[PDB]
Design a protein around this ligand. Structure first.
Ligand SMILES: [Mn+2]
Lengths: 158, 157
């Protein structure tokens, strides 16, 4: 009936401080996609399980350090609505596993093709009330990814 | 006050979807403020060469892999106005550029002032909006979008 997609919000506690003063709370990964839009890592499933496809896609897009974990059904968060069903997952990593994913991503299959690069989501809001999170949210996103990010940030009290 | 930034680029024979030629890998950064921009930053009076200062900040922002090249006066391209943003474009090999991408993840600024690097998609998808025209509707810092555009016309794209 539908064409199934799976995306994953990968995040890690980050005790780091911007400019020595501003607290990042989490490292949260999103990808700049080949179409110029921010989105979550993942894609379409085809693949013995929905978690199989998602993890395969994560490997193709993030590289082999994505085999150091495995997004399982336990990690499964939401399903949003062409005839595409968007299955949203969230996976808590150590900042270690996440840094390693940032390094390995510059040499995944999709580097420079489908994936134009990774970014962290600024959770802070800067001085003038625009810089940081609010400005970040005014870029362009693939369908729902802004809503899945907002949905997920409040599932963490943020 | 003066700032220096650098468009670093290299030929990629990659064919997106097997059909769309990526012509050049062109490197921009997502800054801590949620805006796209070019590697670089403010130049000082302990740098007494605009070029010395720019290379220093690409060491800070991209890591030691940026030591495999130097951006020079001969690469200068524009200035815009108080701060004065000086802009340079530097041709690298893909392997050099690639080294900078994998270096950037271990640079000082990674995870703080630099949220991550992104390439510029130089193509337009068939719908006529995906790719370069949508990328250009993202938020940019300072003169960075016009510097991106001048650089793309002066390279004939
Ligand atoms: Mn100009």
């Amino acid at each position: 009936g539908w064409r199934h997609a799976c995306h994953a919000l990968l995040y890690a506690p980050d005790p780091g401080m911007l400019f020595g003063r501003i607290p990042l709370r989490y490292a949260i990964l999103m990808q700049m996609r080949f179409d110029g839009r921010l989105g979550f890592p993942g894609g379409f499933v085809d693949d013995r399980s929905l978690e199989d496809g998602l993890n395969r896609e994560l490997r193709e897009e993030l590289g082999e350090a994505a085999a150091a974990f495995r997004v399982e059904r336990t990690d499964y968060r939401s399903s949003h609505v062409p005839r595409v069903v968007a299955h949203f997952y969230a996976k808590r990593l150590t900042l270690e596993e996440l840094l390693a994913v940032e390094a390995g991503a510059t040499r995944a299959k999709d580097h420079g093709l489908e994936v134009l690069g990774l970014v962290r989501v600024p959770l802070y809001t800067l001085r003038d009330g625009v810089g940081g999170l609010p400005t970040f949210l005014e870029n362009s996103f693939i369908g729902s990814a802004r809503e899945q990010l907002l949905e997920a940030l409040q599932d963490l009290g943020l």
